[PDB]
């Protein structure tokens, strides 16, 4: 499984999959997605 | 409690709960 992120903290959730939506030592039930790697082509125009 | 607008997309709804005292008697 892969790792999370929280709307407020940040801090590395990596939470498991299936289970339940939260954080660790905090609050809120959110999350969003840590960007990939990732070497991007982008023009610049 | 909620705290918007981080609720929204949670597309939860965004009420609050009504508490109107009943009558039936036991004085309270």
Same mark, same amino acid.
């Given at each position: 499984?892969?790792?999370?992120?929280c709307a407020d903290?940040?801090?590395?959730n990596?939470?498991?999959?299936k289970? &339940?939506?939260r954080c660790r030592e905090c609050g809120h039930r &959110?999350?969003?997605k840590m960007r990939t790697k990732r070497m991007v082509?982008?023009?610049a125009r | 409690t909620m705290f918007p607008q981080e609720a929204r997309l949670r597309n939860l709804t965004y009420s609050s709960p009504?508490?109107?005292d009943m009558r039936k008697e036991d004085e309270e």
């Open positions: 499984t892969m790792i999370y992120l903290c940040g801090a590395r990596t939470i498991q999959a289970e &339940v939506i &959110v999350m969003y082509q982008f023009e | 009504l508490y109107v």
